[PDB]
Design a protein around this ligand. Structure first.
Ligand SMILES: [Ca+2]
Ligand SMILES: [Ca+2]
Length: 498
């Protein structure tokens, strides 16, 4: 399924590259990627990828009508040409663009910030399913990291002002005529909200990981470890001391890692082609990793692709192409206050959370359909005597519907006939089958809260120390209750994942 997605992504990257180039009508002497400038972009799509391009806003017929619309440019000895509204800069350097977050929410905000579009939005959300396993996105124990190592061959930049004289008449009309909120929604939905104004052409290697925060037990910050893991993987320089060697080992054991490459001759070469996941790779293994990377890198100049946003003004609002400053401001305001927040809300991801807890006698410890059983390291009874089992149901957050109530707290009641006050719910089953002892689990339901919702309930089984950031389930006096009645110790613990 991974090789299928890999092939699928490359199919898009190649075919859509060909699509926009063909439609631009630019001849073979025109620098690669020229047609990306002034092409609109789905800001909620993939991170800088031709697949998320929407509509070229320039009039190809007008540009190509005269040789005077082009200027000379020299890249790597090649004498080519470029539409005069574009500024081209040779760079030829390797640079990291990294995104990370200790939760899916923080990760989404971090990658979105790379747009350099002001505000708190969730831009580039379609890249989540490209970079990570879908199920990993909603598992509360994961931290997320996306490492991109880019060979910046050259940068193409333009401005709204420079593109104005070559703008499609259909685009000018749409901008000028967008009156109602629905017109403006339709504008951003149809034409796109932004266009590419600053892009990097060349090649990149991508290395993305979902890492279990609880089992990784890292010394250094997971995002710095991820970058060191990437560098070592492809035979580049990586730290050994300051606990890095052990951190990199732990990181890899605790992570699901996906890789991708764009640009260069990928039919012959692969930046990850000789990659090694060994703790201590040999001289030959490192050399082979480095050789595969260097062979691919050398193929990039003759086969560049769109690979990154430039550092300044990579994406420009389509309203900047308006000739009327009142209309420009109106469209910008609709984006900032209505459309971007509405569209962002639809892409919001939160971890799965516990919405139901049940307890009963179960001889086979088989959960009812849709429910999951309580575990220590493996499946365990809450109370081994009388086969008392706890099962929980998990809900998936969905931005479009009113979400099911979450549970925010757990406690024990050790007396026979007492109901807890307020919104607290007592689970009816007496956990202690002894006739002279009582134990009931109580939970506190509340309207869904991403920060407050319990995500996990676990058993410590005789390993007795309370892990971060979990909580004990306490009786009336505030003490731990041994849930099992045999020659063993069961302590029930829970976490909202902070
Ligand atoms: Ca049951
Ligand atoms: Ca009892």
């Amino acid at each position: 399924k991974s090789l299928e997605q890999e092939n699928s992504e490359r199919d898009v990257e190649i075919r859509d590259r060909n699509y926009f180039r063909k439609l631009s009508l630019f001849d073979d002497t025109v620098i690669a990627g020229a047609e990306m400038i002034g092409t609109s972009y789905d800001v909620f799509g993939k991170y800088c990828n031709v697949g998320s391009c929407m509509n070229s806003l320039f009039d190809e017929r007008k540009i190509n009508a005269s040789e005077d619309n082009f200027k000379k440019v020299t890249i790597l000895g090649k004498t080519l040409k470029v539409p005069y509204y574009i500024d081209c800069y040779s760079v030829g350097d390797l640079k990291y663009t990294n995104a990370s977050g200790e939760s899916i929410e923080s990760y989404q905000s971090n990658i979105s910030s790379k747009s350099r579009i002001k505000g708190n939005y969730l831009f580039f959300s379609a890249s989540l399913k490209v970079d990570f396993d879908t199920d990993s996105l909603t598992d509360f124990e994961n931290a997320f990291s996306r490492i991109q190592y880019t060979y910046d061959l050259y940068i193409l930049k333009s401005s709204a002002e420079a593109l104005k004289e070559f703008l499609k008449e259909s685009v000018k009309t749409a901008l000028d005529k967008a009156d109602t909120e629905e017109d403006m929604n339709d504008l951003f939905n149809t034409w796109g909200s932004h266009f590419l104004s600053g892009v990097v052409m060349g090649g990149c290697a991508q290395y993305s990981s979902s890492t279990n925060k609880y089992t990784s037990n890292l010394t250094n910050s997971f995002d710095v470890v991820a970058a060191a893991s990437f560098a070592g993987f492809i035979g580049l320089s990586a730290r050994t001391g300051n606990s890095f060697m052990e951190d990199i080992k732990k990181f890899r054991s605790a992570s699901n890692i996906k890789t991708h490459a764009i640009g260069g001759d990928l039919s012959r070469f692969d930046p990850f082609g000789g990659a090694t996941s060994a703790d201590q790779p040999s001289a030959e293994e490192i050399a082979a990793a480095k050789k595969a990377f260097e062979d691919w890198k050398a193929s990039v100049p003759n086969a560049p692709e769109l690979v990154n946003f430039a550092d300044s003004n990579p994406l420009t609002g389509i309203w900047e192409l308006c000739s009327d400053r009142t209309q420009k401001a109106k469209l910008k305001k609709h984006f900032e206050t209505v459309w971007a927040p509405a569209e962002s809300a639809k892409r919001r991801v939160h971890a799965d959370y516990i919405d139901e807890i049940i307890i009963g006698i179960n001889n086979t410890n088989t959960p009812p359909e849709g429910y999951i059983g309580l575990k220590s390291t493996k499946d365990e009874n809450l109370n081994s005597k009388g086969n008392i089992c706890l099962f929980m149901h998990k809900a998936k957050y969905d931005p479009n519907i009113d979400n099911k109530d979450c549970i925010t707290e757990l406690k024990f009641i050790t007396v026979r006939d007492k109901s807890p006050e307020g919104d607290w719910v007592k689970i009816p089953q007496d956990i202690y089958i002894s006739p002279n002892q009582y134990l009931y689990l109580c939970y506190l339901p509340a309207k869904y809260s991403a920060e407050k919702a319990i995500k996990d309930i676990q058993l410590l089984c005789s390993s007795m120390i309370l892990p971060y950031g979990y909580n004990d389930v306490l009786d009336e006096r505030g003490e731990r209750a041994n849930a099992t009645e045999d020659d063993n110790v069961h302590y029930l613990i829970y976490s909202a994942g902070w």
